[PDB]
Amino acid sequence: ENLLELVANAVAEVLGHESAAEINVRRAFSELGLDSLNAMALRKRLSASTGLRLPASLVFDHPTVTALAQHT
Amino acid sequence: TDSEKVAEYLRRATLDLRAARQRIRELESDPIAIVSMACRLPGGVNTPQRLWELLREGGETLSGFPTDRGWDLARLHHPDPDNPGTSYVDKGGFLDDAAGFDAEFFGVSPREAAAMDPQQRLLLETSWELVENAGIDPHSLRGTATGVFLGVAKFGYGEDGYSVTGVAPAVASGRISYTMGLEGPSISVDTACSSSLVALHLAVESLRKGESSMAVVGGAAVMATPGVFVDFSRQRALAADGRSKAFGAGADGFGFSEGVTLVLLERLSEARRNGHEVLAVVRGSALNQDGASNGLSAPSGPAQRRVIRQALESCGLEPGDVDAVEAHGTGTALGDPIEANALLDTYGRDRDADRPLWLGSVKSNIGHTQAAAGVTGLLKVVLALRNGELPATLHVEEPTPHVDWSSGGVALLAGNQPWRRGERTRRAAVSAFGISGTNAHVIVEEAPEREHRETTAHDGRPVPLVVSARTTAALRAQAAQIAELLERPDADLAGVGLGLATTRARHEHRAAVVASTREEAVRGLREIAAGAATADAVVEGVTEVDGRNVVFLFPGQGSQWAGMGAELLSSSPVFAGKIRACDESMAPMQDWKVSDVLRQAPGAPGLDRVDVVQPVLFAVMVSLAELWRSYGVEPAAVVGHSQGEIAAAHVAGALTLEDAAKLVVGRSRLMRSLSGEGGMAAVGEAAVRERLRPWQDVAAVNGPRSVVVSGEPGALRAFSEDCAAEGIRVRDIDVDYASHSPQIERVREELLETTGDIAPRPARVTFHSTVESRSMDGTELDARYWYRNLRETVRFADAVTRLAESGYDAFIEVSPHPVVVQAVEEAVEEADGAEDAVVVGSLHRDGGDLSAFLRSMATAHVSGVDIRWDVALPGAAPFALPTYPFQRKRYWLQP
Amino acid sequence: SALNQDGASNGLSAPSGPAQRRVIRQALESCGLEPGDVDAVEAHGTGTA
């Protein structure tokens, strides 16, 4: 639950947002705006922060931000 | 017959010939109706506001070189026309704000939004507004065959990251079809100042070929960089005091600033069939080239005459059937005399005798507007048809003396002329001449008159007023405009949630209000963006699934209200019809009428004897379902228990009406022989199970703490008092009976012989039961099953929990009862399911009426489940609709 | 000939197959020839995807 803020600020950084808090937790990635290799940039940011692996299927595993509890 | 088959062949040949000629005529020419319009001119939105209002007097040319953009000042302006890198004339209108955008509404990242030409943003906004202002819900256009045929030019770029910057200023921006989800052809043309016009021509052809249903035609410009204002200043073409004068005593040719315009076109027959609104008709166009002239950029009169005559021939009309012409003004020292001479030569030559051909130009009042000029002319002409007046601005008195202005029937529009309807159907023409040398001409005609309508309403008739699409816009804030956009000086009804275009699917947020007196929207709903409400449903839906699965509950035995309402019986017709049908079905076996008891008419029996209480409730419950199903709510897994098992079976289609009624009455009568011999208890399962050991006497499990246990006669009252000495939420029990208990006995098998007459049928949807924690099936129901229903324990909470994590899921427990009795009270969060639980109620226990049912539906319209509100409003007409707020600055990378 | 738009599908790029299916069908049906007369097809293919 502590990494939710990490995920939110990583998403804001990769998407160009500055508030890092005005992001709908329960919303699809497409509605919030996303493209191709933005996912791999987010994966690199998570690997730098969390240190976990890069399954590359996490985006389609759970598009909603509120379902980002798969870490660890 | 030899003398008959030949006649039949002749008739078929004649019919086929007529059809073929009609098809040929349709293909070679077909009226095209203009359905809607939207524009963004510098200084104000569109339609009336920035039009019939401003066009009455004029003005414009506010000058004021924009400061929001970079645009280094104090250097562009210099008095010397021959200065190397400066430019004179610092006047010229401009858009109030070009950096405004919403971004999040259309789902684009702010990083990509910053690197984005303003033309695309303005085009997206204007296209949404255009679709909205047509009575067509934008979300229904998805998957259709509409195409875009626009014309856009590249005006500067950002001279200062894995993507974009090669796709945003890409000219070919057909991303409108990407966002909306269209399938028609997407084309971006470029033919200088006439581009929009020729674009229009292409669309017409597609609309006559059947490859597209509706078309979007328009143009745009932004003038991002100083650019043109410098370069033309070095050509000595642009002149000071940039008020362009058409057919006067001046020569400027001023290159006015940006402007965005769009229109929607559809075939006339389709528009009439579907039921849209028609404003004007296009019935001919022509294009040509100046050919080899005396210069690359120089008009040629013969080409203009040829194109005008070609357009007239294509329309199949006569040159004397046009009353007003909009000219390609572009006030210069050479173009105006040539255009005037060409018009005099082609439209003159004894036009009528007394009727003169009125002439005007929009550019004399609004500016050149670059590529979107020609379509802008349309925005004038059509309005002249809708107001019976010619907006003759033409801010110049003395005409040009070079051209023989007199001795002709072409009169300049000095003042204003009435344009009233009546005989001699009105017609008009527009023309455009580009720099490259392409000329276009178009003829437009007034729409046919069909306006009768009717008047209704003004009765009580409570009307739902579902919000004007509380949407993905910031989850807040925008509610403000919807609160204030609904300000009614003098009107009524105005069905917004109707098929009316404003629908917008209420993207995520949604809200509702139900009343019939006044607005009350400026009340709590208004401050809901920063506060709370009093009696209005507010929802935070996420449209997890737009169409939710549906299930119903049917347990009663304890509602026992004081009369299940009567106003809805008089008002709602389907409820009364079902009640009457049930009464007729039950009439030939028992004397009592359910309607009489419901109305509380004199002579009706009291609500004490079970023989009346049990059937009447049944007669209500099914009817309630018939109401819900009447609103597009189709259940799937009715799971109601107790005496409502049979009601659920009837809703499931496994039983007939008369069979269920006779079973109900027989069961009640046979049970009536037992009285004052039983009673349950209302409460931990293990605690009561281990505590009831000293007694030889379980009924139902409604939850972790709502278990109903089987009891015994008055010794059970003593046990209940003993428990009430402790806590354990000791409660009371209803009328005496010992159902779901072994203490029934008595007739026993006598029921099976008396109650066995049924012909069970396969279930239509699902008949999941509580006696067995699994789905039942049709034709598997027998008198023994209902005997065990009254004898065995009820497993309700476990079944509900099992269904909660089931595949259908959807947490849409409705419970159509005259009482709340929703003892489930969620109790599904500990079922490894989702979190968007609805568990809505039904008709209120005490304050129940049609308005209460509408309120319950609105409170049901929360989350995802959808209903058709048009049923509640039989006979109406859409009124009007505003648009979406809240742009923000993006500044398009100034450094 | 025939023309159509891919519509809303994934990102702006990376076209969708059904759109190509529909455009092929429309092109074949415009002239009125069954899809058994074409002997060679010119393809528009470049690298990935």
Coordinates of N, CA, C and O in Angstrom, one line a residue, chain B residues 106-222:
Chain B
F106 N -10.4 14.5 -23.8 CA -10.1 13.7 -25.0 C -9.1 12.6 -24.8 O -8.9 11.8 -25.7
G107 N -8.5 12.5 -23.6 CA -7.6 11.5 -23.3 C -6.2 11.6 -24.0 O -5.9 10.7 -24.8
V108 N -5.5 12.7 -23.8 CA -4.2 13.0 -24.4 C -3.3 13.4 -23.2 O -3.7 14.2 -22.4
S109 N -2.1 12.9 -23.2 CA -1.1 13.3 -22.2 C -0.8 14.8 -22.3 O -0.7 15.3 -23.4
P110 N -0.5 15.5 -21.2 CA -0.2 16.9 -21.3 C 1.1 17.1 -22.1 O 1.3 18.1 -22.7
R111 N 2.1 16.1 -22.0 CA 3.3 16.3 -22.8 C 3.0 16.3 -24.3 O 3.5 17.1 -25.0
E112 N 2.1 15.4 -24.7 CA 1.7 15.4 -26.1 C 0.8 16.6 -26.5 O 0.8 17.1 -27.6
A113 N 0.0 17.0 -25.5 CA -0.9 18.1 -25.7 C -0.1 19.4 -25.9 O -0.5 20.3 -26.7
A114 N 1.1 19.6 -25.2 CA 1.9 20.8 -25.4 C 2.4 20.8 -26.9 O 2.4 21.9 -27.5
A115 N 2.9 19.7 -27.4 CA 3.4 19.6 -28.8 C 2.3 19.2 -29.6 O 2.1 18.1 -30.1
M116 N 1.4 20.2 -30.0 CA 0.2 20.0 -30.7 C -0.2 21.3 -31.3 O -0.4 22.3 -30.6
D117 N -0.4 21.3 -32.6 CA -0.8 22.5 -33.3 C -2.2 23.0 -32.8 O -3.1 22.1 -32.7
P118 N -2.4 24.2 -32.6 CA -3.7 24.7 -32.1 C -4.9 24.4 -33.1 O -6.0 24.3 -32.6
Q119 N -4.6 24.2 -34.4 CA -5.6 23.8 -35.3 C -6.3 22.5 -34.9 O -7.5 22.5 -35.0
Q120 N -5.5 21.5 -34.5 CA -6.1 20.3 -34.2 C -7.0 20.4 -32.9 O -8.1 19.8 -32.9
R121 N -6.6 21.1 -31.9 CA -7.4 21.2 -30.7 C -8.7 21.9 -31.0 O -9.7 21.5 -30.6
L122 N -8.6 23.1 -31.7 CA -9.8 23.8 -32.1 C -10.7 23.0 -33.0 O -12.0 23.0 -32.8
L123 N -10.2 22.2 -33.9 CA -11.0 21.3 -34.7 C -11.7 20.3 -33.9 O -12.9 20.0 -34.1
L124 N -11.0 19.7 -32.9 CA -11.7 18.7 -32.0 C -12.8 19.3 -31.3 O -14.0 18.8 -31.3
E125 N -12.6 20.5 -30.7 CA -13.7 21.1 -29.9 C -14.8 21.5 -30.8 O -16.0 21.2 -30.5
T126 N -14.6 22.0 -32.0 CA -15.6 22.5 -32.9 C -16.4 21.3 -33.4 O -17.6 21.4 -33.6
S127 N -15.7 20.2 -33.7 CA -16.4 19.0 -34.2 C -17.3 18.4 -33.2 O -18.5 18.0 -33.5
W128 N -16.9 18.4 -31.9 CA -17.8 17.9 -30.9 C -19.0 18.8 -30.7 O -20.1 18.3 -30.6
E129 N -18.8 20.1 -30.8 CA -19.9 21.1 -30.7 C -20.8 20.9 -31.8 O -22.1 21.0 -31.7
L130 N -20.3 20.7 -33.0 CA -21.1 20.5 -34.2 C -22.0 19.3 -34.1 O -23.2 19.3 -34.4
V131 N -21.4 18.1 -33.7 CA -22.2 16.9 -33.5 C -23.2 17.1 -32.4 O -24.4 16.6 -32.5
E132 N -22.9 17.8 -31.3 CA -23.8 18.1 -30.3 C -25.0 18.9 -30.7 O -26.2 18.5 -30.4
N133 N -24.8 19.9 -31.5 CA -25.9 20.8 -31.9 C -26.6 20.3 -33.1 O -26.9 21.0 -34.1
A134 N -27.0 19.0 -33.1 CA -27.7 18.4 -34.2 C -28.8 17.4 -33.7 O -29.4 16.8 -34.5
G135 N -29.0 17.2 -32.4 CA -29.9 16.2 -31.9 C -29.4 14.8 -32.0 O -30.2 13.9 -31.8
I136 N -28.2 14.6 -32.3 CA -27.6 13.3 -32.5 C -26.6 13.0 -31.4 O -25.6 13.8 -31.2
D137 N -26.8 12.0 -30.6 CA -25.9 11.6 -29.5 C -24.5 11.3 -30.1 O -24.4 10.4 -31.0
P138 N -23.4 12.0 -29.7 CA -22.1 11.7 -30.3 C -21.6 10.3 -30.1 O -20.9 9.8 -31.0
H139 N -22.1 9.6 -29.0 CA -21.6 8.3 -28.8 C -22.2 7.3 -29.7 O -21.7 6.1 -29.8
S140 N -23.3 7.6 -30.3 CA -23.9 6.6 -31.2 C -23.3 6.6 -32.6 O -23.5 5.7 -33.4
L141 N -22.5 7.7 -32.9 CA -21.9 7.7 -34.2 C -20.7 6.7 -34.4 O -20.2 6.5 -35.5
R142 N -20.3 6.1 -33.3 CA -19.3 5.1 -33.3 C -19.7 3.9 -34.2 O -20.8 3.4 -34.1
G143 N -18.8 3.5 -35.1 CA -19.0 2.4 -36.0 C -19.8 2.8 -37.2 O -20.0 1.9 -38.0
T144 N -20.2 4.0 -37.4 CA -21.0 4.4 -38.6 C -20.0 4.6 -39.8 O -18.9 4.2 -39.8
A145 N -20.6 5.2 -40.9 CA -19.8 5.4 -42.1 C -19.8 6.8 -42.5 O -20.0 7.2 -43.6
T146 N -19.5 7.7 -41.5 CA -19.3 9.1 -41.8 C -17.9 9.5 -42.0 O -17.0 8.9 -41.3
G147 N -17.6 10.4 -42.9 CA -16.2 10.8 -43.2 C -16.0 12.3 -43.1 O -17.0 13.0 -42.9
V148 N -14.8 12.6 -43.1 CA -14.3 14.0 -43.0 C -13.6 14.4 -44.2 O -12.7 13.7 -44.7
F149 N -13.9 15.6 -44.7 CA -13.4 16.1 -46.0 C -12.9 17.6 -45.8 O -13.3 18.5 -46.6
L150 N -12.0 17.8 -44.9 CA -11.7 19.2 -44.5 C -10.5 19.7 -45.3 O -9.8 19.0 -46.0
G151 N -10.2 21.0 -45.1 CA -9.1 21.6 -45.8 C -8.3 22.5 -44.8 O -8.8 23.4 -44.2
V152 N -7.0 22.2 -44.6 CA -6.2 22.8 -43.6 C -4.8 23.1 -44.2 O -4.3 22.3 -45.0
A153 N -4.2 24.2 -43.8 CA -2.9 24.6 -44.3 C -1.9 24.7 -43.1 O -2.4 24.8 -41.9
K154 N -0.6 24.6 -43.4 CA 0.4 24.6 -42.4 C 0.9 26.0 -42.2 O 1.4 26.6 -43.1
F155 N 0.7 26.5 -40.9 CA 1.0 27.9 -40.6 C 2.1 27.9 -39.5 O 1.7 27.9 -38.3
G156 N 3.3 27.9 -39.8 CA 4.4 28.0 -38.9 C 4.6 26.7 -38.1 O 3.8 25.7 -38.3
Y157 N 5.5 26.7 -37.2 CA 5.9 25.5 -36.4 C 6.7 25.9 -35.2 O 7.2 27.0 -35.1
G158 N 6.8 24.9 -34.3 CA 7.7 25.2 -33.1 C 9.1 25.0 -33.5 O 9.6 23.8 -33.6
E159 N 9.9 26.1 -33.6 CA 11.3 26.0 -33.9 C 12.2 25.4 -32.9 O 13.3 25.1 -33.2
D160 N 11.7 25.3 -31.6 CA 12.5 24.8 -30.6 C 12.5 23.2 -30.6 O 13.5 22.6 -30.4
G161 N 11.1 13.8 -28.6 CA 11.1 13.0 -27.4 C 10.4 11.7 -27.6 O 9.3 11.5 -27.0
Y162 N 11.0 10.8 -28.3 CA 10.5 9.4 -28.6 C 9.3 9.3 -29.4 O 8.9 8.3 -30.0
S163 N 8.6 10.5 -29.7 CA 7.4 10.5 -30.4 C 7.0 12.0 -30.7 O 7.8 12.9 -30.4
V164 N 5.8 12.2 -31.2 CA 5.2 13.5 -31.6 C 6.3 14.4 -32.3 O 7.3 13.9 -32.8
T165 N 5.9 15.7 -32.4 CA 6.8 16.6 -33.1 C 7.1 16.2 -34.6 O 7.8 16.9 -35.3
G166 N 6.5 15.1 -35.0 CA 6.5 14.7 -36.4 C 5.1 14.2 -36.8 O 4.9 13.9 -38.0
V167 N 4.2 14.2 -35.8 CA 2.9 13.7 -36.1 C 1.8 14.8 -35.7 O 0.7 14.8 -36.2
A168 N 2.2 15.7 -34.8 CA 1.2 16.8 -34.5 C 1.1 17.8 -35.5 O -0.1 18.1 -36.0
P169 N 2.2 18.4 -36.1 CA 2.0 19.3 -37.2 C 2.1 18.6 -38.5 O 3.0 18.9 -39.4
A170 N 1.3 17.6 -38.7 CA 1.4 16.7 -39.9 C 0.3 17.0 -40.9 O 0.2 16.2 -41.9
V171 N -0.3 18.2 -40.8 CA -1.3 18.6 -41.8 C -2.5 17.6 -41.9 O -3.6 17.9 -41.6
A172 N -2.1 16.4 -42.3 CA -3.1 15.3 -42.5 C -3.5 14.8 -41.1 O -3.0 13.8 -40.6
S173 N -4.4 15.5 -40.5 CA -4.9 15.2 -39.1 C -6.3 14.7 -39.2 O -7.3 15.5 -39.2
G174 N -6.5 13.4 -39.4 CA -7.8 12.8 -39.5 C -8.1 12.1 -38.1 O -8.9 11.2 -38.1
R175 N -7.4 12.6 -37.1 CA -7.6 11.9 -35.8 C -8.9 12.2 -35.2 O -9.3 11.6 -34.2
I176 N -9.8 13.1 -35.8 CA -11.1 13.2 -35.3 C -11.9 11.9 -35.5 O -12.6 11.4 -34.6
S177 N -11.7 11.2 -36.6 CA -12.3 9.9 -36.8 C -11.7 8.9 -35.8 O -12.4 7.9 -35.4
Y178 N -10.4 9.1 -35.4 CA -9.9 8.2 -34.4 C -10.5 8.3 -33.1 O -10.9 7.3 -32.4
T179 N -10.7 9.5 -32.6 CA -11.3 9.8 -31.3 C -12.8 9.4 -31.3 O -13.2 8.7 -30.4
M180 N -13.5 9.8 -32.3 CA -14.9 9.5 -32.3 C -15.2 8.1 -32.8 O -16.2 7.5 -32.3
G181 N -14.4 7.5 -33.6 CA -14.6 6.2 -34.0 C -15.4 6.0 -35.3 O -16.2 5.2 -35.5
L182 N -15.0 6.9 -36.3 CA -15.7 6.8 -37.6 C -15.0 5.9 -38.6 O -13.9 5.4 -38.3
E183 N -15.7 5.6 -39.7 CA -15.1 4.7 -40.7 C -15.1 5.3 -42.1 O -14.6 4.6 -43.0
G184 N -15.7 6.5 -42.3 CA -15.7 7.1 -43.7 C -14.4 7.6 -44.1 O -13.4 7.6 -43.3
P185 N -14.2 7.9 -45.3 CA -12.9 8.5 -45.8 C -12.5 9.7 -45.1 O -13.4 10.6 -44.8
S186 N -11.2 9.9 -44.8 CA -10.7 11.1 -44.2 C -9.7 11.8 -45.2 O -8.8 11.1 -45.6
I187 N -10.0 13.0 -45.5 CA -9.3 13.7 -46.5 C -9.0 15.1 -46.0 O -9.9 15.8 -45.4
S188 N -7.7 15.6 -46.2 CA -7.3 16.9 -45.9 C -6.8 17.5 -47.2 O -5.7 17.1 -47.7
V189 N -7.5 18.5 -47.8 CA -7.1 19.1 -49.1 C -6.4 20.4 -48.8 O -6.4 20.9 -47.7
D190 N -5.8 21.0 -49.9 CA -5.2 22.3 -49.8 C -5.2 22.9 -51.2 O -4.4 22.4 -52.1
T191 N -6.0 23.9 -51.4 CA -6.1 24.6 -52.7 C -6.2 26.1 -52.4 O -7.1 26.8 -53.0
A192 N -5.4 26.6 -51.5 CA -5.3 28.1 -51.1 C -6.7 28.5 -50.6 O -7.4 27.7 -50.0
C193 N -7.1 29.8 -50.8 CA -8.2 30.4 -50.1 C -9.5 29.7 -50.4 O -10.5 29.9 -49.6
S194 N -9.6 28.9 -51.5 CA -10.9 28.3 -51.9 C -10.9 26.8 -51.4 O -11.9 26.1 -51.7
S195 N -10.0 26.4 -50.6 CA -9.8 25.0 -50.3 C -11.1 24.4 -49.7 O -11.7 23.4 -50.3
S196 N -11.7 25.1 -48.7 CA -12.9 24.5 -48.1 C -14.0 24.3 -49.1 O -14.5 23.2 -49.2
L197 N -14.2 25.2 -50.0 CA -15.2 25.1 -51.1 C -15.0 23.8 -51.9 O -15.9 23.0 -52.0
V198 N -13.8 23.6 -52.4 CA -13.6 22.4 -53.2 C -13.7 21.2 -52.4 O -14.3 20.2 -52.8
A199 N -13.3 21.3 -51.1 CA -13.5 20.2 -50.2 C -15.0 19.8 -50.2 O -15.3 18.6 -50.4
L200 N -15.8 20.8 -50.0 CA -17.3 20.6 -50.0 C -17.7 19.8 -51.2 O -18.4 18.8 -51.1
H201 N -17.2 20.2 -52.4 CA -17.6 19.5 -53.6 C -17.3 18.0 -53.5 O -18.2 17.2 -53.8
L202 N -16.1 17.6 -53.1 CA -15.8 16.2 -53.0 C -16.8 15.5 -52.1 O -17.4 14.5 -52.5
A203 N -17.2 16.1 -50.9 CA -18.1 15.4 -50.1 C -19.4 15.1 -50.8 O -19.9 14.0 -50.7
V204 N -19.9 16.1 -51.6 CA -21.2 15.9 -52.3 C -21.1 14.6 -53.1 O -22.0 13.8 -53.0
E205 N -20.0 14.4 -53.8 CA -19.9 13.3 -54.7 C -20.0 12.0 -53.9 O -20.8 11.1 -54.2
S206 N -19.3 11.9 -52.8 CA -19.4 10.7 -51.9 C -20.8 10.5 -51.5 O -21.3 9.4 -51.5
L207 N -21.5 11.6 -51.1 CA -22.9 11.5 -50.6 C -23.8 11.0 -51.7 O -24.9 10.4 -51.4
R208 N -23.5 11.2 -52.9 CA -24.3 10.6 -54.0 C -23.8 9.3 -54.5 O -24.5 8.6 -55.3
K209 N -22.7 8.8 -54.0 CA -22.2 7.5 -54.4 C -22.6 6.4 -53.4 O -22.3 5.2 -53.7
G210 N -23.1 6.7 -52.3 CA -23.5 5.8 -51.3 C -22.3 5.3 -50.4 O -22.6 4.4 -49.6
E211 N -21.1 5.8 -50.6 CA -20.0 5.3 -49.8 C -19.9 6.0 -48.4 O -19.0 5.7 -47.7
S212 N -20.8 7.0 -48.2 CA -20.8 7.7 -46.9 C -22.2 8.1 -46.5 O -23.0 8.5 -47.4
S213 N -22.5 8.1 -45.3 CA -23.9 8.5 -44.8 C -23.9 10.0 -44.5 O -24.9 10.7 -45.0
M214 N -23.0 10.5 -43.7 CA -23.0 11.9 -43.4 C -21.5 12.4 -43.5 O -20.6 11.7 -43.4
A215 N -21.4 13.7 -43.8 CA -20.1 14.3 -44.0 C -19.9 15.5 -43.2 O -20.8 16.3 -42.9
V216 N -18.6 15.8 -42.8 CA -18.2 16.9 -42.1 C -17.3 17.7 -42.9 O -16.2 17.2 -43.4
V217 N -17.6 19.0 -43.2 CA -16.9 19.9 -44.1 C -16.5 21.2 -43.4 O -17.4 21.8 -42.9
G218 N -15.3 21.6 -43.5 CA -14.9 22.9 -42.9 C -13.4 23.2 -43.1 O -12.7 22.5 -43.9
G219 N -13.0 24.2 -42.4 CA -11.6 24.7 -42.5 C -11.2 25.4 -41.2 O -12.0 25.7 -40.3
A220 N -9.9 25.6 -41.1 CA -9.3 26.3 -39.9 C -8.0 26.9 -40.2 O -7.4 26.6 -41.2
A221 N -7.6 27.8 -39.3 CA -6.3 28.5 -39.4 C -6.0 29.0 -38.0 O -6.9 29.1 -37.1
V222 N -4.7 29.2 -37.7 CA -4.4 29.7 -36.4 C -3.4 30.9 -36.4 O -3.4 31.7 -35.5

